[PDB]
Symmetry: C5
Subunit: 346 residues, 5 copies
């Protein structure tokens, strides 16, 4: 019962002629590689960049007859990771990496165990910054689907095939929550077989269904956008005398409404389509621009009105200042219903 590495000497070195430069079952059927990932860290979901950082354990399993062994008694030899640069390993890469890296802290974070019948279990900790093109049409109420797809790079489909094992292909750490999102529990697992001018390459991808939390965007942008609408209404309970007051009120509540429009996109890409948060800030910018025009009508109607005529327009001009107090606060409401219900069924 010699030590395992010396047993591994019989397994790896020039004895038996193991070559790590040639895939298993060479010249025969392709190599069936079953995969699955464990997720430690999920988050930093960027939107200026439209990517996100994950921290996974990538488990790979394939059979290699050359790694058979019956001398040793037990069923598994979880070796040292230094034995990992000498056996064959599939050239798995992430088709949307945007930068990734291993982890070498106190050891290469690597695992490797071999079953008697040649089954290999290979597992390494990885940090990825995967690209997912965000779809920001209905932005605060959107549901993103950021993917990650595992391709081969040098082996064609007839010489290396990936799969997902049918027992929980994607696990997640227990207490894993996101600050801005929630990660839905059903995770898709479909095929993405690529085709180039070089050949066809195996591919498999996992679809994570993110979904934004409404709390933050409800506190910083919607409510402050809404109070500024109400102050635009207090220009109606003021007489048609305070020219500086109402105009000063409206202008101050139309420029601050312009700042928050731009402020609602500081942390966003410069996309060219209008998004759900945009029509809110637009329509809220339309009401406030109306009250500054409503007083524009009053101050002009009253100034234009012999003595039986001037009061004749005071009633009309003052009729407006009472219609305004109900028109705006209710027209805004019915709009406020068609908006949220539009994004409660979309």
């Amino acid at each position: 019962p010699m030590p395992p590495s010396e047993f591994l000497d019989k397994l790896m070195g020039k004895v038996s002629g193991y070559d790590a430069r040639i895939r298993p079952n060479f010249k025969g059927p392709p190599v069936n590689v079953t995969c699955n990932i464990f997720i430690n860290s999920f988050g930093s979901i960027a939107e200026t960049t439209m990517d996100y950082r994950v921290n996974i354990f990538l488990r790979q399993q394939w059979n290699d007859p050359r790694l058979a062994y019956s001398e040793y008694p037990d069923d598994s030899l979880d070796l040292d990771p230094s034995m990992l640069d000498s056996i064959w390993k599939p050239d798995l890469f992430f088709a949307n990496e945007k930068g990734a890296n291993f982890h070498e802290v106190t050891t290469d974070n690597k695992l490797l165990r071999i079953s008697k019948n040649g089954n290999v279990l290979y597992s390494i900790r990885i940090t990825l910054v995967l690209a997912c093109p965000m779809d920001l049409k209905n932005f605060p109420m959107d549901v993103q689907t950021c993917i990650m797809q595992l391709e081969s790079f040098g082996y064609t489909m007839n010489d290396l095939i990936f799969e997902w094992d049918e027992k929980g292909a994607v696990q997640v750490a227990d207490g894993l929550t996101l600050p801005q999102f929630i990660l839905k529990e059903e995770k898709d697992l479909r095929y993405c077989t690529k085709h180039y001018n070089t050949g066809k390459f195996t591919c498999i991808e996992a679809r994570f269904h993110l979904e934004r939390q409404m709390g933050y965007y409800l506190i910083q942008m919607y409510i402050p956008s809404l109070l500024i609408v109400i102050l635009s209404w207090v220009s109606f309970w003021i007489n048609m005398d305070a020219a500086p007051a109402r105009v000063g009120l409206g202008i101050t509540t139309v420029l601050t409404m312009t700042t928050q429009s731009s402020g609602s996109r500081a942390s966003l890409p410069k996309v060219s389509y209008v998004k759900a948060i945009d029509i809110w800030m637009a329509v809220c910018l339309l009401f406030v621009f109306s009250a500054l025009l409503e007083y524009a009508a009053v101050n002009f109607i009253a100034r234009q009105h012999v003595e039986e005529m001037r009061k004749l327009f005071i009633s009309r001009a003052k009729r407006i200042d009472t219609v305004s107090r109900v028109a705006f606060p209710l027209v805004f409401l019915i709009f406020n219903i068609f908006y949220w219900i539009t994004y409660k069924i979309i």
Copy 2:
């Protein structure tokens, strides 16, 4: 008495058949690894990212019978760190690293000494950026508990076990203070034994109880939020004549109160729950929005009031402008008591 490395030649090389690729006490009980950390640098506690950077010395101790020696006279051979790539070392990693690194400046910052009975003392300087999910419910008065946990990655529980030595498992440099926090002196030391679809892996974690200093947030956000509330009150000692003054006063003190609401979260994650600093900026935004409505009542009540009737509402409208001077400054106070006492016992 040959030189130690040549003595180490007898200890390491092909003589005696030392293999660094196989753990001590192989096929027997697992390897008991006692740990403890020394902390040089603690800080850069991020909250947008919810991590923090530490600079530790990681000390590991385990027994290895193969490293026994009785030839040399003294009790310890603190070797060169180049002898560190040839002996066995536990594959300790940090389960929430988020990026780490060694230090190679003028030497690998590594220590290694071996006692006669085989005890190994292994110590290396590390920089870590550990992830700790912040809980920002009561934000300026919160108490975070950021952890660090030491797991194995390739050895299962029956073949490698970590522990904390029971003599000061976590030391700290003497004059170590944080700018924003204070690091409490009692540090937890519990177990975090993991379970995967691969097996069970040893784990141990240290719980550091951070606690925010109230000084900064008391100077930039609470007091400026409070002066703006008081200026909202000076719209009461002004007659019910200065329409531009009081409305200009209230509007200017309701928008600047909106900026500071958003300004109170520039360096924060976009969490979806309301936090303690939020109800302050909200309630302070409610008082100021009230004074702008209080004058909305006065200017409307006085404008609506034969000659025995107009003065009848001047008293009512002026009754308000005196009730306001005591109502707001005292209602705000009683709120100001239920707030701080709520976060002095929570």
Copy 3:
């Protein structure tokens, strides 16, 4: 039928005297290297820096007679990438890299296959941050032409020549869209043969015609710039009595128009020439500065006007306040036509 690497032993090692340090067809005609790129990731088109990040697959093809083989039966031996540090490879570099890198995640992302007649197919995943000097004359309506050029660095033109293969020299991933641009489908392919004091070096470049999307810049800068122009007009339907109102209106709508001028260049280089977005913000800053002067004329003309004289200037001063309501809203329009048509045919 020995294994291929051992077949490759006959192909690479000291047998047959293959030297990777000497180009093919040595002392004869130069080495004809046909190229083409596949683009996975395109974007992060910076403008403060005037660069952009691409993620390509660089395919290279050249003949090497030394790599001939007739022993093996089939037509191609797609080897392991470890066989890539032993064969000759052209020293292709990117003449405007500004930083690049390979991808080592789970494998060097490399491909290598050899045809029987010696044809080499070499393909590697690369991330580039290529420099392209932006031309921002007509900025929101511009069309950039960012290049990428493949030069030799050590081999002169008579010893190594690059080319583009005449079957789709530049492919693109199917669903590849940009957030801010659209990538036109015709891609140029011309020569860029360099000359130094060392000699002449082969060079080939690809010209990508980017083109900005107008949606974002139409929403954040043009419309907000335009509403502020209209509020500058509401200072005309107000009587020549509200000195605080109209002046407060104009000043508030002339400073906020100054902020947006500077705000229209936060994410731009500090170029010294005037650009298309600049004349908009300038002319819009000229109208608003006019209305604040138009009231400057009214308040001065009315204040200067025995009793038959004061009304004589009221008509003139009030004649202005009606000419203004049509002059500005129509002069702005005709300008608004010469502007967009100027950038619809330029």
Copy 4:
């Protein structure tokens, strides 16, 4: 007279049995290592992070009898830096590195020369980002003392000792100035002998006395803070009639004074103690808050004043508006004297 490296062959290789893995004078007295640094680049003194970047040449000198030589005629053999991975070198590290690095541009920036009697001169270019906890009590007038300390990491005090040579232990490049500071010329040199649970380790540190330049902070924060105080005074030469003017004046000069308070700390850590720049912005925020209350008294006193009574308070209310014009401008001055003299002797 064979070539020196072949002479060095007799000096380094298996001939003579030189081992680089064992310190000089082994088993005897410790190794006396005299040090000194030359500073090329000093600066980037961060305060959000409380560190700073230096670029030094670290010179080390120790004796090694094994490196004796009398064959060669001259006194010094400045070798190639490749000979630096074969001789012993002290494991000097920087106890507050916070990240450092060598320089490999066109060569490892390393020097190495050996005197006949065994004296070694070892010198390498380094970039450091050293941590120094700032003390920001009297911030714009402060004097920081950022240190750098050279410790051993694996050798205890009885086996390796550092020192500073007594001929200019710290030189500086000639034209080395800082943008924000000035580096005082006397530099401290004391001992910092550490103690751990492992043993006692040699340590030496250099104390650089930085001192801020007052020019910048005098131009951006003090003067603008002071003009805004004066405009708060121009609310006194205005009659007690312009309710919108004085209140608009005071409010506009009390909120802009709040912005600059927060603006005076954008580039600062979130420390919890009040600092010298804070009491300035506070007291300046107290004067401006007073003038807005001073008019609060006037408009209330005049509004409260049969016909012999109303003028009786006009004199009192107008008595205030003249006392204000001298009270504030002189009370501010005497404060302005106790402030600067307080930070001219502290």
Copy 5:
């Protein structure tokens, strides 16, 4: 006619005893190294950091008799760059690197050719971030002189000397323009021979004369600073009645003039000396502060004026409001002439 590397075998390996660890002409005169650089990328001229990034080709030439060859027929053997780790190479470094790096994309970007008489031509692509202390006295009209200097680090002056070849020591790529600067065509080439406590080291530096483009700073800071001065003048064509208007006008045009003062230094170091852009923003801040005081005089002079007396000061107070309309607009102009002419001859 064996292959060149095998010819190079006779040139490099143990045959002939070539040692790369010993400089040419050893024990004799020093090694004369002629240099010159080609500049691809110039720019990213930082000012917060006072550095800049360049992308050069560094060509070095020296003679090495050991590399003589007469066997081969032609005049030059441009080898593979792998032959670059075996020949001697001067240890050139950049005395103000602040971080640099090679380029390894698809090959080490290296060139190496050897003439028959031993002349070596060595050329490598480099990216540098060189430090140049900016002199910002007359900031928008300044002319910086950022240097780059090539020193030895281990060889003293009597054993290695650098030079510039007298045929175009510094070339530049053809279409190389900067966004903010223009690179003057005459480039200095002088000596910078260093002296340390170790010895004297060869040094040579190149002086690039940068010069700012005035376009950007003329558009964002001077003109907006100037319009705000003119609006400060429109407080003069308004009667001495509009207390809220003129004071509101002046205050709004004195605070926005304070923001732009600070805004004129966001991207600048915190230098302690006053700079040319500072006196502009200061003097422009002095005019606007004057108009707010000019009305302070009017409203006080008119309010202080039996019936023959009140009109007596109306003329004096109104005499001011006409002197102002010519005093300020012309005093500002004459200042505006002494300013630009002062920076047209400095």
